[PDB]
Design an enzyme around this catalytic site. Sequence first.
Site: not given
Length: 363
Positions: A136-137
Site C-alpha cells: 500500500p502507498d
Amino acid sequence: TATYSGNPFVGVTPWANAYYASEVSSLAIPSLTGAMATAAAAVAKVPSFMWLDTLDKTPLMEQTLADIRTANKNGGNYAGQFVVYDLPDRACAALASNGEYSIADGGVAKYKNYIDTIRQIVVEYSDIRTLLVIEPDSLANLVTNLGTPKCANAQSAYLECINYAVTQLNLPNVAMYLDAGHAGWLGWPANQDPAAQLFANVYKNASSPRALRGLATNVANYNGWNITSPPSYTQGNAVYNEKLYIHAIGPLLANHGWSNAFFITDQGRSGKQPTGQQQWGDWCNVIGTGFGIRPSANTGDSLLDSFVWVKPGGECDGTSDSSAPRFDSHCALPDALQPAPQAGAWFQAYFVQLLTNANPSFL
Ligand SMILES: *[C@@H]1O[C@H](CO)[C@@H](O)[C@H](O)[C@H]1NC(C)=O
Ligand SMILES: *[C@@H]1O[C@H](CO)[C@@H](O)[C@H](O)[C@H]1NC(C)=O
Ligand SMILES: *[C@H]1O[C@H](CO)[C@@H](O)[C@H](O)[C@@H]1O
Ligand SMILES: *[C@H]1O[C@H](CO)[C@@H](O)[C@H](O)[C@@H]1O
Ligand SMILES: *[C@H]1O[C@H](CO)[C@@H](O)[C@H](O)[C@@H]1O
Ligand SMILES: *[C@H]1O[C@H](CO)[C@@H](O)[C@H](O)[C@@H]1O
Ligand SMILES: *[C@H]1O[C@H](CO)[C@@H](O)[C@H](O)[C@@H]1O
Ligand SMILES: *[C@H]1O[C@H](CO)[C@@H](O)[C@H](O)[C@@H]1O
Ligand SMILES: *[C@H]1O[C@H](CO)[C@@H](O)[C@H](O)[C@@H]1O
Ligand SMILES: [Co+2]
C-alpha cells in the site's frame, strides 16, 4: 491445492485472525460495558487483513495459516488475508524513516529476503487460498510524488521489489491485488492514465502473473464505495467515490495491456459519510468515521470482487506526540483524533468512534 477460477473471494470465507481479535477482546472490551461491550465482541468477528509490516511479523503469518488449516479440516472453508508492506524507504512521502529497511543500507536485497520467507510459507500452505494486498502507498507515490526526492530516488527500488514480490508469490492458491491508492489520489482525471500505465507496466513486466487478479483501493483511507453526493472536500473531482474510480481506471488498464483486472476496496473506516476530513489529503486518524460495508463478494458490480477491511479499524495510523521519532504533522491536525499512539498500536478512542458511527451498525 486451494486453486480458484474467477473471483477468488467466491467459494471461500475470509478468516478473522486471532491477532485483531486479541486486540479487541483484550485491549478494548475490558474498557466497555453493556451494549458497547457486546457490540465490540461482534466487530472482532469481521475478517480484516493481517499486515506483515516487519520481518518479525512473518512467523505470525504461518501461525495464522496454521490456525486456518486446523479450521478447514473441520468443515472450515477459510482463506487467509495478508498485506505485504515492508518496502525499503517505505512511505517515501514522509521524511522520517517509516520502515525497518532503507535503500541506502542493502534495502532491496533485504526486501527480497523478506519475500523469500513469505513464499516459503505460502508454498507450505498451498492448501489454503491466500488473498494478498501488495505494498500500500508505494506505486501511487511514484505517480504523484516524484517531486519529493525520497520518492524520486526510490522509484527504481520500488519497481524492482514489487516485481520480485509479484513473480515470487505467483502461485495457484494466491490472489494478489496491487495497491492503487484511492479516488482522491489517482482518481483525479489527470492522474488516471499515468496510473493505469504504471500498473499495466508492472503487470506485463512481471509476465502477466496469473495470480495478479487486479488492484486494491482505499486501503487505510475513508472514501465511500458508492456515495451519491460529493463531499465538500472532494471539490473538483468527478471521481469522488471508489466505484467511480475503479470504473474509470479499469478500461484504461485494458487499453495499456492489462485486461481482466478486477478490484477490492477497503471500507473498514468508510461507514460514515461524509467524514470529518477538512481536507481530502488528511489521512491520519480522521475524526467522524465509522466501520463500513462488511466484507462480501456480493458487490452487485462486475469490477469489484469484494468489499474488504484492509486497515484494521482501531489500529492507529500515527502518533500525535510531536517529540516521537516518526511523528507526522498530519496526525496533529484538527480533523485528526488525539491523543494518538504510534502507528499500528491500539487506539481505544478511535475504535470506539468507529463502533459508535458504524453502518451497518453493530449496536
Ligand atoms: C521490471 O522488473 C525489473 C526487475 O528485474 C525492475 O528492475 C524494473 O524496474 C521493472 N520495470 C517496471 C516498469 O516495473
Ligand atoms: C452501496 O452499496 C451497498 C452495499 O452493496 C448497498 O447496500 C447500497 O444500497 C449501495 N448504495 C447505492 C446508492 O447503490
Ligand atoms: C483449481 O484446480 C482444482 C483441481 O485441482 C479445481 O477443483 C479448482 O476448481 C481450480 O480449478
Ligand atoms: C465460509 O464459511 C462461512 C461460515 O461457515 C460459510 O457461510 C461460507 O459459505 C463458507 O463456507
Ligand atoms: C493478543 O494479541 C494482541 C495483538 O498483539 C495483543 O495486543 C494482546 O495483548 C494479546 O496478546
Ligand atoms: C476476543 O475474545 C472475546 C471473548 O471470547 C470474544 O467475545 C471476541 O469476539 C474476540 O474473539
Ligand atoms: C487478549 O489478550 C489477553 C492476554 O493479555 C488474553 O488473556 C485474552 O484471552 C486475549 O487473547
Ligand atoms: C480501555 O479504555 C479505558 C478508558 O475508556 C482505559 O481506561 C483502559 O485502560 C483501556 O484503554
Ligand atoms: C451485551 O449483551 C450481552 C448479552 O447479549 C451481555 O452479556 C453483555 O453484558 C452486554 O450487555
Ligand atoms: Co513452519
